[PDB]
Design a protein around this ligand. Structure first.
Ligand SMILES: NC(=O)c1ccc[n+]([C@@H]2O[C@H](COP(=O)([O-])OP(=O)(O)OC[C@H]3O[C@@H](n4cnc5c(N)ncnc54)[C@H](O)[C@@H]3O)[C@@H](O)[C@H]2O)c1
Length: 208
C-alpha cells in the first residue's frame, strides 16, 4: 500500500546517518560515499572498521535512519584513535537509490539468510518500526522516526554523490572549521563537548 515516501512523511524522518573516521571525510566530500568493492575497484585508500563484512554485502554502503548505530560506532571509537564524524544524508536516498532495509544489523542470523529481494521496498522498510523485532521491543514512547532496533541498517547498493550529504557533524569545533575551510559550500556542525546529549551518545540517553 504505502510508499517509502509516505512512511517517511508520516513518521517525520528527516535524517539518515553514516559514521566514518575523519581520515575518510576529504575523499567522501570529493567523490561521495562508495562501497568496499568500489573503493577496491579504483584501489582508493580508506579507513574501514569491519574487515570481513559478514553481512556479505561489500558492494553496499551502510546507513542508519534517524540515529547512528550507537553500539557499533561506540565499539569502533574505542579501537582507532582520532576524530570521528557523522554524515547527515537526505532521506531521498531510500528511493532514489537501490536500498535494502534490515530491521536489525544486517549480519544478524535473524535476517542474513533472507532473500535480498525481499529486503527491498516499502514492506521491508516498514519492518524497521515493528513493536517487536526479534525480541527487541519498541517502547511506546519512542518517537516515530526512530527504528525499533538502533542497529537497523540501510544497505545502499549504488554510490551516493556528495550532493546527498546535507551536513556533517564533528566531535569538536576545530574539526568542523578545518573542513569548513576546505569545503566552504558545505554545512559542518559541531558540539562544544560530548558531555551532553549528542549523536555520539547511546540513543536511550540521547532521547531520555
Ligand atoms: N557507517 C555507518 O554509519 C553504519 C551504519 C549502519 C551499520 N553499520 C555497520 O557497521 C559496520 C562497519 O560499516 P562501515 O560503514 O564502517 O563500513 P566498512 O567497515 O566496510 O568500511 C568502509 C569505510 O569506507 C568509508 N568510505 C566511504 N566512501 C569513501 C570514500 N569515498 N573515500 C574513503 N572512504 C570512504 C566509509 O565511511 C567507511 O568508514 C558494518 O557492520 C555495517 O553494516 C555502519
Amino acid at each position: 500500500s504505502m510508499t517509502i515516501q509516505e512512511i517517511i512523511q508520516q513518521r517525520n524522518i528527516r535524517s539518515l546517518f553514516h559514521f566514518t573516521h575523519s581520515d575518510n571525510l576529504t575523499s567522501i566530500l570529493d567523490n561521495g560515499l562508495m562501497s568496499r568493492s568500489e573503493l577496491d575497484n579504483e584501489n582508493n585508500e580508506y579507513n574501514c572498521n569491519d574487515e570481513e563484512r559478514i553481512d556479505g554485502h561489500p558492494d553496499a554502503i551502510c546507513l542508519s535512519v534517524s540515529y547512528p548505530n550507537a553500539k557499533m560506532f561506540y565499539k569502533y571509537r574505542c579501537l582507532k584513535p582520532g576524530d570521528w564524524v557523522i554524515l547527515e544524508i537526505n532521506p531521498s536516498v531510500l528511493w532514489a537509490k537501490d536500498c535494502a532495509f534490515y530491521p536489525t544489523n544486517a549480519a544478524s542470523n535473524n535476517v542474513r539468510f533472507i532473500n535480498l529481494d525481499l529486503m527491498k521496498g516499502a514492506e521491508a522498510f516498514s519492518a524497521l518500526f515493528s513493536e517487536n523485532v526479534f525480541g527487541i521491543q519498541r517502547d511506546v514512547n519512542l518517537p516515530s522516526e526512530y527504528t525499533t532496533d538502533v542497529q537497523a541498517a540501510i544497505l545502499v547498493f549504488e554510490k551516493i554523490p556528495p550532493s546527498y550529504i546535507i551536513s556533517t557533524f564533528h566531535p569538536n569545533k576545530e574539526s568542523a572549521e578545518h573542513f569548513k575551510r576546505l569545503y566552504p559550500q558545505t554545512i559542518q556542525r559541531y558540539y562544544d563537548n560530548l558531555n551532553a546529549r549528542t549523536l555520539y551518545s547511546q540513543r536511550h540517553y540521547y532521547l531520555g
